[PDB]
Design a binder for this molecule. Structure first.
Ligand code: CO
Ligand code: FE2
Ligand code: FE2
Lengths: 285, 284
């Protein structure tokens, strides 16, 4: 079976862009150094250690108490906010991928941890958070890109993501067989990039030794689509410590869909949002 | 030749909905009382008298100087924010129209004034702010609704909006003649309601004298779609003086697209935005 291509960080962007249209997915090998990965893991550990609140939790309250989830990791994990989120290889890919739709930003970035004994996900498309995506035709400009960060090893046994190459060209998901998929086996620091409409499934975790598989999922969307997570409650001090790119990703700046939108989006008083807010940024100068 | 149906403000919503799927548009007669129309007009006169800006204007700078425009009237006109934005009939229509896509909110509401001697708009659909709308099939859940408030009289002289009935079912805009459209002639306090994909055009203004024609356009979108105007810089006192419904329309609350989105949208910390912000409201 044709496998997912593993590319070094210096790989050609045109090539990556074409990989996404032909195969629908690929892996960037060793993008994040191990020190970044381990700093990110420790920040995430802090969040998972927090005793559960007394109040409502929108997603978590639907699941049993052993559910492992960290929402909107950019507000609590400085390593993601300052290093992972603004990786220039990721954004080179995004800019080439989103060329026909225009600007993109971060819709969500969150931790999942899959424990030993968990079954695999059903095969699906990532068209549920913004259901209108389910009706976009294949040839329309893509509005969503999935970026999957393994924070432990992804192996065959512990549930490496199952991806069916070319499946973004299918009419429906149907009920595909597992052996039609290939495995995104990976080391921490690798990155898996998945095109809109590609049929895939988390592999669960069939190990029995008690070692959980840890994944951070980041969804970059056209700025036409409302971010699932809103970063508007970030303190000004935190917002201003980020770079312009980071501020743009977290919804703090006016953005531009492609023509025929010739004005922009996410603005106020006919001015750019960062101007009305007098937003400073770390790399303004 | 079929005309725009004129309906009483208290008409049945099922009939308003049949019209939007058959004609694609209709007119509500006398929805806003005269005292609402007058105070709204007074609040817009204040903004119209604000001196010309010193910095860039994202929209205004794109067009010649006869472009009279007041963006995001929700933040500067209390009558719109406290009365027109939350009108219960408008929302009965919206809830029915957006049933398949789920929750909706305000993408934009703004004032345009069209002086004498202005030519009509080219025929078009309202699919430019969110270009992905161009590729949605006709059968897919609608994600946008246009609500047009005449603040002066719309007449055949001064450029009442031209609407081509049933044109939401066309594959493309094409090159339609002006005589394929019917005119949304209205008095202030009426409301023109236009379905997504309906071909239409601003009438311009064929008059030679007279004050400009004045219109407030509100675009209501699925909460899946990012609001053109962000109301996030409204002061907390202003936000908490509004009703829950008002806060939802202006992006200050977590919202719910339809299943299979089973969590919602516009949340933070796995919590509702209004709960993180400890947001009071006029009616909660
Ligand atoms: Co003719
Ligand atoms: Fe998925
Ligand atoms: Fe229009």
């Amino acid at each position: 079976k044709p496998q997912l291509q593993r590319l070094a960080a210096d790989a050609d962007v045109d090539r990556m862009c074409r990989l996404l249209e032909e195969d629908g997915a690929f892996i960037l090998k060793g993008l994040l150094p191990f020190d970044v990965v381990e700093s990110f893991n420790r920040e995430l550990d802090v969040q998972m250690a927090i005793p559960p609140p007394k109040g409502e939790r929108l997603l978590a309250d639907k699941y049993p108490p052993h559910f492992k989830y960290v929402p909107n990791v950019a507000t609590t994990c400085p390593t993601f906010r300052n290093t992972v989120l603004i990786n220039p290889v990721i954004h080179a890919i995004c800019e080439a991928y989103f060329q026909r739709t225009g600007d993109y930003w971060l819709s969500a970035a969150f931790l999942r941890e899959i424990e030993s004994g968990m079954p695999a996900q059903p095969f699906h498309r990532d068209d549920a958070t913004h259901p209108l995506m389910h009706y976009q035709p294949l040839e329309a400009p893509p509005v969503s890109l999935s970026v999957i960060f393994p924070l432990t090893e992804f192996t065959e046994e512990n549930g490496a993501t199952e991806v069916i190459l070319g499946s973004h060209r299918w009419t429906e998901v149907g009920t595909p067989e597992r052996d039609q998929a290939v495995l995104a086996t990976m080391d921490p620091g690798d990155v898996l990039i998945v095109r809109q409409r590609v049929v895939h499934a988390g592999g669960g975790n069939r190990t029995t030794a008690g070692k959980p598989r840890r994944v951070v999922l980041a969804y970059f969307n056209s700025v036409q689509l409302t971010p699932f997570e809103t970063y508007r409650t970030m303190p000004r001090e935190m917002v201003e410590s980020m770079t312009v790119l980071g501020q743009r990703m977290l919804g703090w700046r006016t953005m531009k869909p492609s023509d025929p939108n010739i004005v922009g989006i996410n603005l106020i008083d006919d001015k750019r949002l960062e101007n009305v807010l007098q937003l400073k940024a770390a790399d303004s100068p």
